[PDB]
Amino acid sequence: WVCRKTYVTPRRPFEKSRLDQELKLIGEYGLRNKREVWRVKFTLAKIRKAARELLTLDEKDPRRLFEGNALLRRLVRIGVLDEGKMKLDYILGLKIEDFLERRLQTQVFKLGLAKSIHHARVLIRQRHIRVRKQVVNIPSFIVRLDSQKHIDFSLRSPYGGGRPGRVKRKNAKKGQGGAGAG
Amino acid sequence: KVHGSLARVGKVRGQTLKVAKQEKKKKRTGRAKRRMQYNRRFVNVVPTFGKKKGPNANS
Amino acid sequence: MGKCRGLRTARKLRSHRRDQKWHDKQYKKAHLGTALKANPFGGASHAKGIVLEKVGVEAKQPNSAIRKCVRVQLIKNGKKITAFVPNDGCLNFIEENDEVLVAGFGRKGHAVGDIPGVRFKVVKVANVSLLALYKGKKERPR
Amino acid sequence: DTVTIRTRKFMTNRLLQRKQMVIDVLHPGKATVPKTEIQEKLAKMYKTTPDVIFVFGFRTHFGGGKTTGFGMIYDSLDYAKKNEPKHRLARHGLYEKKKTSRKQRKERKNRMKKVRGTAKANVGAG
Amino acid sequence: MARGPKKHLKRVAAPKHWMLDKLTSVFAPRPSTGPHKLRECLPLIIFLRNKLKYALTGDEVKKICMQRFIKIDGKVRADITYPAGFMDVISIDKTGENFRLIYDTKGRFAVHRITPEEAKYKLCKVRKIFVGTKGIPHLVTHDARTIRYPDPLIKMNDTIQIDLETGKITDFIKFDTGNLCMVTGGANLGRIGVITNRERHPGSFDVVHVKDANGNSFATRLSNIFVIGKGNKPWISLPRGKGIRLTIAEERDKRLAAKQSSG
RNA sequence: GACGACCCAUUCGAACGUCUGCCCUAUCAACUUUCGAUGGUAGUCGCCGUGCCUACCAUGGUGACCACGGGUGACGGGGAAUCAGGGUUCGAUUCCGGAGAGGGAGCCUGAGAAACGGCUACCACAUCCAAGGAAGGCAGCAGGCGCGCAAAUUACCCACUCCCGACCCGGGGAGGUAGUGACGAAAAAUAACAAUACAGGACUCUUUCGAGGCCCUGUAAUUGGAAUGAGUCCACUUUAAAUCCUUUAACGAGGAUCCAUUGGAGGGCAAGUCUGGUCGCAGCAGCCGCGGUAAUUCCAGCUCCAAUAGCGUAUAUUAAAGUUGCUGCAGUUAAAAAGCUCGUAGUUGGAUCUUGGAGGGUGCGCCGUCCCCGCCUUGCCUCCGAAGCGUUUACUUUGAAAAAAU
């Protein structure tokens, strides 16, 4: 029954400069709320703290070696991070976009199959998107590397095939009952 | 040192001519509303270097 | 540096600190259990009582108003306490022999504003929320 | 739309007279499948017949067109009827049995306690 | 509490090395009284339905046992929570499988099939060696088996090949510098290795410096050392891994290399 | 193919014994024994150690290195919360150890109980009665009263997880299962895309006027095709049987919705150099301060901000607070060096006793770079191992021993 919080609010609350920054992030990133950003500012701070500790340790130090390499390999599987980075010295010099860039929502834009970070989120939350055998409704997801290619509309949502739409199918029978017969 | 009155208790609330509610619009659901905010604020929002301006201004 | 620096001298430093902690008022309050012993509310956060009478209290200078509190006997320890009645005409809503839920100012036990010797505020009557009453969400039930 | 019943992770378990395995049911695009359809369909892959292929668990996945469950198929209908959870046999038209629902019975027994030995006396009283 | 023997185990307060999940219920099996101490044992139920997957329910584990399907050291055992342990055999017949309970390098009772021979005999570490009643002497092994009339060489900490049908020691190994060893507890639980040194303390506590077939050195308490034969010549099966112990990096190096390609 | 016994060991334990670590307090400084306080010696007792008890016999044992006494929003710990680092605070409460079942005391049985879903007395409470009698203990599960700031069903099941018994089979308010459930934590709906239509800006062309143009955002005009569960619902799944989830045929989005909120907009502080109303009145205002007739603080709207299925308020406590200051405070004048010196505890203490090339870890493409080690007087003696064996420590170093959950 163990549980933990996933976000952290900023010490302080009114620093125009920070607020604007967050708003630009929501906009580019079809985000919903500040928490939506705060959640990531939080995710990142822990990663950076994880990193900083490690970087203070001796290199070759079974603890530093075994966990450093792991943090890196984890950070790379998600594309968040790259090789020269792909050492700890580079994660220290990293940022939020790099995570934010891997969510669904922005990818469904990023290859035509949405044309909007907008469209993207309503598409995702509405069941028209599988990551290869599996519908994924979590506009919040995190697309892994060799998983980038398997993202596509789903086997039945109409695009993806399958009749029309509880509203399109309404319209077909909308030209049927009146204009066909009585 | 207290004596005095209350006769006047609630004098302004009861004298403040009620106002309609009027109405109009719904403002937008979560993230969409955030989106309108970001475009109105930042895209919109081009700004001039007019030495600034405001959010809840009249003339 | 007013404080030995010998490897040994843990006990002197440890104890000298224990001796000076007292002057901290928050600390002393806590160790003497003042909240249990002096305070009208138990060492609790809210407290309910009966209304004895309605007071119009004479706000301190340079301000000038009649304040509007009730005097309340707390059921828990028969303690007598005066409590502010906030918002416009809300006295209205509390009558003698009423019941009421009282709460602290948010001042740490120290009276608020111009309102002199009053350290508490009404929150509920009609068991029923001055706010909901003032708005007219809910009524003076009966 | 055809389906397809796929049996993953097989174990031949002699000491309980049955072959036990996961049941992976594709149903491409609708949902579902009946427990009865599943036992019928399995009955014909393990050369056994329905009444030896109990089937249980089950949760269609996320979004549609698959369902993973669990099955057992018994080497003797006797062996099943005896290694068997009773509630399992009851579920299909071979096992059913008495209810209560439980506190009526406990009450009976507590009434019986009052009475010295005999107790059958307490039976006629309940 | 405080008037008598505990009969329940809150799961979570059970020994980790059974690897029971956290959710499921409140209580773990709790080993019956038997030949192995409760921490250091493996209740059959965990073996039948938690490691071997023969059983699902506990109701099933019982149904299996009442058949008589399963013997420990040769002699049908019919209790759900029987406390089996290190050097025990366990034989399921109408299934033809013989397993010896001996450790992982994790320190987890390992699922270790052994031949249809071997299953005959087990190696017990002498715990005490005794002049019993009427002047007879006896040895006592870890697994709580007392054998009278043993041969006079056998001394505490030596190990001893028991037949098994018959009881009967059918030889022995001395504890001496250079013997092969199995580690039966503590940080090093599961590591196998030669010896090197026994540091001796009066009053209490003797340590055994062990060296593995990789010139990896480590210590444990004498209490934790079990003799299993002569270097390169175990007297039993060893599980895959030869109780080696590999650094978490070495462990990763093996895991990714053996597969997603390498057959 | 269907339990006893003697004695020993074993297993689960038990009962005691070692140290080392605990809150506040000196407006608690001496304490403990003639009803043993500390010790001898012997016995009786106990499962057994032991002033346990008792005789005799000594006169001890403890304290400024805080004893003794008193207090306590003290059950103890694993743990929790607050994150520079140091720290700061909590811990009844899913585990461990301890304690109790109205208060007190006693006891039976049995291997195990000083048991209360045993008993027995008194003491406090309550109940039945034909008035002599008689029967009882929810700090078990539900529920109810009282109490209060505050806390759920008089529901289903032994199928899971395990336990017990003569037991595969029975029994389990252990425990699971549903109901209540914004402690609190996770996922995150209440609407996406063109088009006209327009409103617009970097780009280009032009002497200018003027025109083109990419990137697009709105904003209507309605369109236009493009959509999904929230509800509802054959069927099916879940499971002991159900529910819900996770599953879906048939339905379910043109806004007046299938209708999002709660605080703020004078300063700190994010946001009205508003409009009506009042005129230091009502109210606002943690603090500073507003309102005494052009109120950006009120009262309302309008409009805007902030956090958003959550948000305000009160309160304990923590961070901030280097305002308790080890790290890391101040004390001439701001709050603070005793009038001065002696002085025990405590703390604190000068210099000086041994010198003067390759082995192994991880980076970079057979080569090397950068640690670590015995080297270019270093345990004596007993007489390689063994043993003798340590001058005491603190320290620090390397091991083992180190509950799980966390």
Side-chain angles (χ1 to χ4, degrees), chain E:
Chain E
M1 354 212 220
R3 322 192 236 121
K6 239 78 100 180
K7 244 19 223 197
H8 294 83
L9 234 186
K10 339 223 144 154
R11 176 206 212 77
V12 171
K16 201 37 179 169
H17 60 285
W18 294 356
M19 293 300 293
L20 292 174
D21 61 356
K22 282 184 326 142
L23 275 66
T24 61
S25 178
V26 175
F27 316 99
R30 161 153 264 275
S32 295
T33 58
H36 301 291
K37 307 203 308 300
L38 129 35
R39 240 127 202 218
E40 293 177 350
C41 296
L42 292 174
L44 177 63
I45 186 167
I46 294 169
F47 177 80
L48 254 27
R49 86 40 114 90
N50 271 322
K51 299 296 183 181
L52 297 174
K53 273 309 170 328
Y54 272 134
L56 305 221
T57 61
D59 184 1
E60 281 174 7
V61 174
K62 203 84 176 171
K63 291 179 179 179
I64 294 169
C65 4
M66 296 297 103
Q67 238 51 311
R68 321 222 110 217
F69 262 117
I70 296 169
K71 291 174 65 175
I72 291 169
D73 291 345
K75 305 222 154 94
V76 174
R77 256 49 218 234
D79 205 308
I80 295 169
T81 58
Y82 179 86
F86 177 80
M87 284 304 166
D88 288 345
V89 177
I90 295 169
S91 178
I92 303 301
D93 289 345
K94 238 141 152 226
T95 58
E97 1 122 61
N98 192 31
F99 299 97
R100 152 160 276 131
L101 294 174
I102 292 169
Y103 306 103
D104 289 345
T105 189
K106 272 14 212 260
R108 273 179 321 197
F109 264 120
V111 174
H112 182 62
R113 278 144 180 117
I114 61 171
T115 60
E117 183 65 13
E118 232 128 330
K120 255 82 226 223
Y121 75 83
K122 31 155 25 161
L123 255 16
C124 295
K125 133 174 117 242
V126 348
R127 220 154 42 101
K128 96 177 39 223
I129 295 100
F130 243 88
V131 174
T133 117
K134 284 281 179 196
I136 289 42
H138 60 266
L139 293 174
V140 175
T141 60
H142 66 120
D143 61 356
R145 282 130 151 318
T146 189
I147 339 297
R148 49 236 227 117
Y149 292 127
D151 325 350
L153 1 121
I154 295 169
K155 205 72 85 187
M156 293 183 284
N157 289 337
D158 287 345
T159 59
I160 293 169
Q161 186 173 355
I162 295 100
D163 184 1
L164 252 255
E165 250 31 26
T166 60
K168 349 293 247 261
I169 61 171
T170 57
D171 289 345
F172 55 100
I173 295 100
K174 278 194 355 94
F175 159 122
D176 267 349
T177 59
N179 289 337
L180 201 241
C181 256
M182 224 194 324
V183 175
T184 59
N188 290 337
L189 177 63
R191 301 244 243 167
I192 290 169
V194 296
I195 294 169
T196 299
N197 246 354
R198 82 239 254 195
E199 277 197 17
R200 244 218 235 188
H201 290 84
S204 66
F205 295 127
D206 296 13
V207 174
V208 174
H209 294 83
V210 174
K211 215 171 250 145
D212 98 70
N214 287 337
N216 288 337
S217 295
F218 59 88
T220 58
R221 301 263 251 239
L222 217 207
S223 65
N224 269 343
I225 294 169
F226 194 115
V227 283
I228 61 171
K230 285 187 183 52
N232 289 337
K233 184 167 66 59
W235 291 95
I236 61 171
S237 7
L238 295 174
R240 42 164 231 302
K242 275 105 264 162
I244 294 169
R245 167 139 223 203
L246 359 83
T247 58
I248 61 171
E250 291 177 350
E251 173 192 5
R252 180 240 293 121
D253 290 345
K254 329 291 199 235
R255 190 153 249 128
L256 62 80
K259 144 199 154 356
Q260 289 0 20
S261 280
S262 67

Side-chain angles (χ1 to χ4, degrees), chain A residues 118-177:
Chain A
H118 207 145
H119 182 62
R121 200 196 232 353
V122 175
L123 295 174
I124 293 169
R125 179 60 178 163
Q126 295 177 335
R127 283 254 204 77
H128 301 291
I129 61 171
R130 293 182 183 174
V131 172
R132 189 201 76 236
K133 244 359 234 99
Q134 293 177 335
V135 174
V136 175
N137 148 98
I138 302 130
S140 178
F141 177 80
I142 294 169
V143 175
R144 183 181 251 108
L145 177 63
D146 61 356
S147 178
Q148 236 170 298
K149 64 179 180 180
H150 301 291
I151 293 169
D152 184 1
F153 296 97
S154 65
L155 296 174
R156 159 272 246 213
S157 65
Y159 353 171
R163 307 129 58 161
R166 101 160 132 275
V167 174
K168 247 195 30 226
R169 291 177 64 84
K170 195 227 322 222
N171 290 337
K173 295 179 179 179
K174 98 88 142 26
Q176 294 177 335

Side-chain angles (χ1 to χ4, degrees), chain C residues 6-69:
Chain C
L7 227 205
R8 272 172 99 160
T9 60
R11 154 169 290 109
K12 257 87 91 92
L13 293 174
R14 168 188 196 162
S15 63
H16 187 279
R17 168 68 74 234
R18 210 144 77 218
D19 291 345
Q20 294 300 320
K21 245 281 192 84
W22 284 108
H23 288 305
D24 258 321
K25 170 225 175 142
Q26 295 85 0
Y27 176 77
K28 183 178 179 180
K29 235 346 132 298
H31 300 291
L32 295 174
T34 61
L36 295 174
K37 16 167 116 181
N39 292 337
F41 282 18
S45 64
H46 297 242
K48 291 174 65 175
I50 295 169
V51 176
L52 62 80
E53 87 193 89
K54 296 193 270 181
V55 173
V57 175
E58 182 135 4
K60 296 187 264 186
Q61 277 255 334
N63 267 352
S64 64
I66 293 169
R67 242 52 272 208
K68 357 180 137 312
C69 292

Side-chain angles (χ1 to χ4, degrees), chain D residues 5 36-53 55 73:
Chain D
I5 316 180
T36 60
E37 292 177 350
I38 173 56
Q39 292 177 335
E40 292 177 350
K41 195 153 225 176
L42 197 28
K44 79 106 175 109
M45 291 300 293
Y46 295 93
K47 326 185 226 177
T48 60
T49 60
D51 290 345
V52 174
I53 290 165
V55 175
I73 293 169

Side-chain angles (χ1 to χ4, degrees), chain A residues 8-24:
Chain A
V8 173
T9 58
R11 143 106 24 215
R12 330 236 240 128
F14 307 122
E15 321 141 26
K16 184 167 121 166
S17 63
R18 162 182 79 74
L19 296 174
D20 288 345
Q21 293 177 335
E22 292 177 350
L23 225 188
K24 294 175 170 182

